[PDB]
């Protein structure tokens, strides 16, 4: 079926499939590498294949292209996009820089390429605290996610200016204190791993506040977990740790953009060499500096 044809074309194209943790299980199962956004960025700096098929969202594929100008990067659907990244506009960044001209600008690694050109360093949920703590300023411009910004402020003690003020990931915003209560009711011996893009009051109920990479690293600390992040992470964790139990905090917590990627459009991506991801060089050069700096700092 599609799996057999995909694998043949991957060989014919000298291609590698990189997948995010939130991809469908059947897509994770054909990927050469699976990770969070930080791990995907790092993995993109050691690509020896000629073609990268990105089972993720468009701005992640753009980050891979920024790091690999001489490789073909394919996004299987141009509708695979990130609602959180779309909330941040250049006008938000310019506005904040005029109010705080000496503050570093710290932006999520899969913001738009134009936004990343204004970043001094990029971050993800996995390294935001580590990076911001190392910056020598007590005020930081940070976005797009106001909930991650709040967590960073709490963990560093710095003043974190969120750009844009309402930016957030709708998937993580959904989680409520009622979901915490239901999780404790259903799995009283489970510990709660809660992503730092959840709202602060949900974060305060966590047994561990952790990025998805942190969820993998700290999963060894217990045998039973309820997972407050996008539901496909539960499949990823179950695959890594077949001896443990993982339960989604919400069955309906899914990223529509991530699920634009299908086995069928991965097959079509390799067959027809589409859709080719390109980033203008002036933007790419500035974004590359911020991404490479992030990788040096983490
Ligand atoms: O892997 C991440 O950093 C991540 C964490 C929460 C939500 N989304 C993402 C993403 O990359 O789309
Ligand atoms: S899960 Fe949230 S931050 Fe990650 S791609 Fe989807 S909308 Fe964007
Ligand atoms: Cl490779
Ligand atoms: Cl994460
Ligand atoms: Cl194309």
Curated annotation (Swiss-Prot):
InterPro entries reported in the protein's UniProt record: NadA, NadA_sf, Quinolinate_synth_type2
Outcome following mutation: residue 110 to Q: Loss of activity
Gene Ontology BP annotations: 'de novo' NAD biosynthetic process from L-aspartate
GO molecular function: 4 iron, 4 sulfur cluster binding; metal ion binding; quinolinate synthetase A activity
Cofactor binding comment, as recorded: Binds 1 [4Fe-4S] cluster per subunit.
Class of the enzyme per the UniProt entry, highest EC level: transferase
Gene3D superfamilies from the UniProt entry: NadA-like (3.40.50.10800)
Localization, UniProt: Cytoplasm
Reaction catalysis annotation: iminosuccinate + dihydroxyacetone phosphate = quinolinate + phosphate + 2 H2O + H(+)
Entry cofactors: [4Fe-4S] cluster
Domain of life (superkingdom): Archaea
E.C. designation(s): 2.5.1.72
Record-level GO cellular component terms: cytoplasm
Binding residues for iminosuccinate: 20, 37, 108-110, 125, 195-197, 212
The entry's keywords: 4Fe-4S, Cytoplasm, Iron, Iron-sulfur, Metal-binding, Pyridine nucleotide biosynthesis, Transferase
Entries under Pfam families matching the protein: NadA
Pathway, per record: Cofactor biosynthesis; NAD(+) biosynthesis; quinolinate from iminoaspartate: step 1/1
The record's note on its domains: Contains three domains displaying pseudo-three-fold symmetry that each contribute a cysteine residue for ligation to a centrally located [4Fe-4S] cluster.
Cross-referenced NCBIfam families: nadA, PRK09375.1-2
Subunit: Monomer. Homodimer.
Record family assignment: Belongs to the quinolinate synthase family. Type 2 subfamily.
HAMAP family from the UniProt entry: NadA_type2
Function recorded in the entry: Catalyzes the condensation of iminoaspartate with dihydroxyacetone phosphate to form quinolinate.
UniProt-recorded name of the protein: Quinolinate synthase
Lineage, top ranks: Archaea, Methanobacteriati, Methanobacteriota, Thermococci, Thermococcales
Gene (UniProt): nadA
